[PDB]
């Protein structure tokens, strides 16, 4: 209606008289508040902008230094601290959390459909992100894919990255135990060349023309955990996810996590940035720090 | 103060700066030249230097001879003699 509708707007623009537009039909006008008393006449300028940063970042006086400490307040054993924290986490927002969790369910078909084409999956946002994937994977993916492939359910392992002892050689050992790939000759391990990387480079070519199906899924939690965020492990997973037979569902929590990866890694690792925020307490994660 | 004089650009000084440093007139601030034994020479090639990684022209250097030494050493009849005293 491009040519006519503009004429309609132009003609109808000049018609209505500004005076007689009654915004509300049945309103009673605002009177004068009686008392003057109730109207008692009791930091920086910018809060969220680079000028806000500038304003908040300036100099302060030393004698204006309130040298106060938490010992100027009760300090009691951590047992009841955790008790009350868990009480609040189990009784303060339980009903809304359950309802929003149920609302966040109908996207499982979308998740599975995307996984079908071989796209590695993302999960960022606020709150614990463990009580979502552990029930997503087991209760949706393996049975549905097992039935669609036509047999046994597709097996899976879990990778707790937040572990300060999370290494990669044991992970590759488990990969060898489960998938059972072929070993390497002596003419390719070039002068102490790392075994796992070359083995995976052989495996990707071995699977380059195998039936386009699924055989296993590996899950990760807190990908940016202390001993898991290291370049070796990250490179291993980034070269890993070219497999069609397997794909990864990933959880993330850090604000600057997105700078940890390289453009090549993103090209080979192909997350799809789904946002899922829940405002959860992460009680069980409060065990390492 | 006044056959003419020509100054040489940064590109021209680039080539000759290494000729200076390779003739044992300058050094690096926290330098250590030649390790005595095998283990030290081995660790030398394993761990690299800030001077190695930072660019050419901003690594801290050091001097061998001092102004007054050069002043009493050089032939004082040079046109640059008037410019050998701080």
């Amino acid at each position: 209606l491009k040519q006519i509708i503009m004429n309609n707007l132009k003609e109808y623009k000049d018609s209505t008289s500004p005076g007689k537009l009654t915004l509300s039909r049945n309103f009673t006008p605002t009177p004068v508040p009686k008392n003057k008393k109730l109207y008692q006449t009791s930091a920086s300028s910018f809060l969220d902008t680079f000028e806000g940063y500038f304003d908040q970042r300036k100099i302060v006086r030393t004698n204006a230094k309130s040298r106060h400490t938490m010992s100027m307040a009760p300090d009691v054993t951590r047992e009841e601290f955790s008790l009350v924290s868990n009480f609040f986490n189990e009784n303060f927002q339980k009903r809304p959390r359950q309802k929003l969790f149920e609302i966040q369910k109908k996207m499982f078909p979308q998740y599975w459909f995307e996984l079908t084409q071989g796209f590695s999956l993302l999960f960022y946002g606020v709150g614990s992100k463990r009580n979502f994937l552990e029930e997503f994977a087991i209760d949706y993916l393996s049975p549905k894919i097992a039935y669609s492939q036509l047999v046994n359910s597709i097996p899976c392992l879990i990778l707790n990255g937040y572990n300060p002892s999370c290494n990669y050689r044991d992970v590759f050992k488990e990969i060898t135990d489960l998938l059972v790939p072929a070993e390497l000759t002596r003419s390719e391990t070039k002068y102490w060349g790392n075994h796992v990387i070359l083995q995976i480079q052989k495996m990707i070519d071995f699977y380059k023309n195998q039936p386009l199906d699924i055989k296993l899924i590996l899950v990760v939690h807190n990908l940016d955990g202390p001993s898991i965020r290291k370049n070796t492990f990250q490179t291993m997973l980034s070269f890993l996810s070219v497999i069609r037979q397997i794909a990864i569902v990933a959880s993330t929590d850090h604000i600057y996590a997105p700078l940890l990866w390289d453009n090549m890694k993103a090209q080979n690792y192909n997350f799809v940035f789904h946002d899922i925020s829940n405002f959860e307490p992460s009680t069980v994660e409060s065990t390492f720090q | 103060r006044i056959n003419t004089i020509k100054l040489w650009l940064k590109k021209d000084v680039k080539n000759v700066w290494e000729n200076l440093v390779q003739l044992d007139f300058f050094t690096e601030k926290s330098a250590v030249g030649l390790r005595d034994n095998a283990t030290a020479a081995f660790y030398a090639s394993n761990y690299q230097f800030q001077g190695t990684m930072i660019p050419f022209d901003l690594r801290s250097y050091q001097m061998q001879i001092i102004l007054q030494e050069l002043r009493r050493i050089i032939p004082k009849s040079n046109m640059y003699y008037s410019w050998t005293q701080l």
């Binding site: 680079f50 940063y53 453009n263 993103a266 | 080539n15 660019p55």
Partner: protein, 246 residues
């Protein structure tokens, strides 16, 4: 090349004596020009001769051999400028070009002497700005080893200096929700991560490097010329920020 030019010119007036004489005087010119450059070395002179001989031979002629001073005047250009390396300088994206521009500023400018020139908002609530640099500096920190900084500084300054995009129309709703200013997307993160492997942004040199840490300081490894070449090519101007202090 001798025989090449002797028949490219097609002049039947020559002899080995005169060939040797012309080569001898050309070498006399070479040494008289570049002795100050090197002095008493042979290897570099031979390399330079191999590089620049053909251009001189391409200019010699009958009149130039009869009177070699004009021949030297016609080939004086290589003597005056070696220029022995190799319009454009890059085939990169725009944010890669424009963000490296910011970093040079964020390590050669004082953190406090920038709020005067790097602000464009109109004040609303009460507050005073600073007086800037009351005292001129006489060292021109171009000559100095650069400083350290956190990345949020780069974010802020890049947001400030970013070219204009998100064209508006001043309509009833055009600018009501456009928010015409680049924000912290993912592409800048990725192209910045690329730069470290490009070794143009330098961090504290570390085996077992960790891009993610509260305590990491950052820096750059580029001279003034690297940054200058970008400015006029992209039609950006920052020389005025540095040309006034010293």
């Amino acid at each position: 090349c001798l025989r090449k030019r002797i028949i490219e010119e097609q002049i039947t007036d020559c002899t080995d004596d005169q060939f040797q004489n012309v080569a001898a005087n050309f070498i006399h010119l070479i040494v008289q020009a570049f002795h100050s450059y090197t002095g008493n070395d042979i290897f570099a002179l031979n390399d330079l001769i191999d590089f620049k001989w053909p251009k001189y031979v391409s200019r010699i002629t009958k009149e130039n051999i009869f009177e070699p001073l004009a021949l030297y005047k016609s080939a004086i250009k290589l003597f005056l400028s070696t220029d022995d390396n190799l319009s454009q300088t890059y085939d990169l994206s725009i944010i890669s070009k424009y963000l490296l521009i910011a970093s040079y500023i964020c390590s050669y400018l004082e953190p406090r002497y920038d709020a005067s020139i790097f602000s464009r908002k109109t004040r609303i609530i009460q507050g005073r700005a600073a007086y800037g640099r009351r005292k001129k500096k006489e060292v021109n920190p171009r000559y100095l080893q650069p400083s350290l900084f956190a990345i949020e500084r780069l974010l802020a300054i890049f947001q400030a200096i970013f070219p204009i995009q998100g064209k508006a129309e001043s309509g009833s709703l055009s600018a009501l929700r456009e928010e015409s200013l680049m924000k912290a997307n993912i592409e800048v993160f990725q192209n910045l991560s690329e730069l470290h492997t490009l070794k143009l942004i330098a961090t504290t040199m570390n085996k077992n490097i960790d891009y993610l840490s509260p305590k990491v300081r950052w820096k750059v490894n580029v001279p003034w010329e690297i940054i200058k070449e970008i400015s006029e090519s992209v039609h950006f101007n920052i020389s005025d920020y540095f040309s006034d202090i010293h």
